[PDB]
Design a protein around this ligand. Sequence first.
Ligand SMILES: Cc1nccn1Cc1cccc(C#N)c1
Ligand SMILES: Cc1nccn1Cc1cccc(C#N)c1
Lengths: 264, 265
Amino acid sequence: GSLTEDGLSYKEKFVVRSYEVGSNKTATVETIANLLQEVGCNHAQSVGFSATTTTMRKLHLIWVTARMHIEIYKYPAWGDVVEIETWCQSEGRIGTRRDWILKDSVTGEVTGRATSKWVMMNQDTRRLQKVSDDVRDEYLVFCPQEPRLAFPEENNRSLKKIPKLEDPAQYSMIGLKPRRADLDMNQHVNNVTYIGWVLESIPQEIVDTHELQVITLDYRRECQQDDVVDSLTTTTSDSQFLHLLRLSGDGQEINRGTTLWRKK
Amino acid sequence: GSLTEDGLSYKEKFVVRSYEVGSNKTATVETIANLLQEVGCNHAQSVGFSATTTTMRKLHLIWVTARMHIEIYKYPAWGDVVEIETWCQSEGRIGTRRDWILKDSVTGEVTGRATSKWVMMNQDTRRLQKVSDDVRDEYLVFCPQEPRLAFPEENNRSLKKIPKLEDPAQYSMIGLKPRRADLDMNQHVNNVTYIGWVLESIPQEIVDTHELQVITLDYRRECQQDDVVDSLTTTTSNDSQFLHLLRLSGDGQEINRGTTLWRKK
Ligand SMILES: Cc1nccn1Cc1cccc(C#N)c1
Ligand SMILES: Cc1nccn1Cc1cccc(C#N)c1
């Protein structure tokens, strides 16, 4: 991987692995989401991050994902090479955004795109906060100054408000719990695990006859390593679904989302 | 990746990813096991397979893992490049063996080694069988003729018999179940998922203070996509050793047994 000529974005190529594909012999959306996190980490390393900047480390502040939105036109097949370009942008005091474009390396055709919203949190109190001027200034030298959007369209799917699923859910998968492979280097549940848990309550008949085109996921609260989650899904329709992940015991919301599926 | 000069082994380099590492910022043993499966698949593809031979497909036969044995001296760090070499060998009519050697790409130093035993099974009946002469001849042109062992030692750990853990277990993790990410392209549970499930019943205090040096796992029966598993562990021992058992949560049918050896950091 490498930063592009202007140093304001980063590109990396990945060869899709045998264990990374589903029944169609193409990459799962969780494999895609892991590759998006990997190219994002490689971009942060390339621009000098140990993605906390020096001012954030002094104030014990970290970036946390508020929303992930991914749209796939074609999933890369096993053995195929996918090229992913990523970049960041400041969204004033709200937080930051990281965008991605996925391309077929042979044809140069765009096969997918993604966007994510990040908010600042104090790592100890877990209290959310606005982005300060010092953090905005030290971040802005690594971002394009003019807007560059993976989802430019006004009122597009990536910005839509997601409602809360009402009981009873049409489908459910209960008792989901993370294992050590679901944790990151800081012993926190990996953001991609929540995508897998949301998808657990989609009936296999949909998975067997449809391809996932769009997924939007809001992250409200973290699942701890010792927590247990229930995954709930209701059809709202192409097939569209509304999703909710909540703690198995008291029903505290951890995520809400929507998925759009196209018949194969 | 590529076959070596003589065409009897295959090498591939991997850059360790951010999500592939644990608390020490080095690759987990499950990341290592996935890389071993990946280089094995790339080797089979390079020599013309798709690893069922022509005679195997005619008779509806497949290879299934009977045992996996991995020894790691140093886990590669995040961003490091690891080179893995793999090869296969026929073990007469018993089955086949696939071996691997892991090296640090910069220093050329061996950082790990692994071996696995495979047996033939009829895909439909699930009945095990001996390897026929036609199958043995068809895959012998892709294997070294002289023995080449990742574990040459006289009575090495990779061949030891594993006993059955007796109840009560010292530690347990109950109600483990696969999700879609644990399945392969044929909707079967990936062999690496069972390694993760075995390790779930090792106490976190051991994981925090020790490094896993050796794991040997016997595969007795498959966990189906709708099954639920219990992971059981008992200490058998500066080094800590454990005995492991995975069984179905309901009736207690054995699916795997194994042992792990850990060295204090
Ligand atoms: C055995 C197990 N499966 C899920 C959680 N855990 C336990 C645990 C506790 C604290 C930190 C970690 C890490 N890393 C893990
Ligand atoms: C929702 C879920 N989590 C684990 C199993 N499953 C259901 C299932 C059934 C049959 C085939 C497959 C595949 N592939 C999956």
